[PDB]
Structure 1
Amino acid sequence: SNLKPFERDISTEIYQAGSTPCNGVEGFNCYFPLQSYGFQPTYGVGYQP
């Protein structure tokens, strides 16, 4: 669910997307909620940091 103003969240718990309970570090409809960006000098505006 969305978080309230200035509510910092650091948890990296594997998020469950479907009906099956989220077991292990990975699974169907189980996802690591953090993704890395892409930043390189070859990039243009809109994708620069």
Structure 2
Amino acid sequence: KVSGNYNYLYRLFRKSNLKPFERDISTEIYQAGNKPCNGVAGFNCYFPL
């Protein structure tokens, strides 16, 4: 669209590489350190898709 097809969502990070023919539905704010950054944002605490 001229306003942008803002419907399909891509991923850019995961804890480990996934085996083929596998799908996930869950979206959780990431934690990538010793501090359990659950929260809403922080050090590598971003929205998945």
TM-score, normalised relative to structure 1: 0.51
The residue number in structure 1 matching 2:30 is 15
Structure with bigger gyration radius: 1
Can you give the 5+ residue segments of structure 1 that lack an aligned partner in the other structure?
35-49
| Distance across 1 between alignment mates of 2:17 and 2:30 | 14
RCO higher in 1 or 2 (8 Å CA, sep ≥ 6)? 2
Contact 2:30–2:38 at 8 Å: present in 1 too?
A: no
Can you give the 5+ residue segments of structure 2 that lack an aligned partner in the other structure?
1-15
TM-score, normalised relative to structure 2: 0.51
The structure where strand makes up a greater share of residues is 1
Number of positions where the alignment pairs a residue of Structure 1 with one of Structure 2:
34
TM-align CA RMSD: 1.4
Displacement of 1:12 in angstroms is: 0.6
After superposing on structure 2, the runs of 4+ consecutive aligned residues of structure 1 that deviate more than 4 Å are none
Identity of aligned residues (%): 91
The residue number in structure 2 matching 1:32 is 47
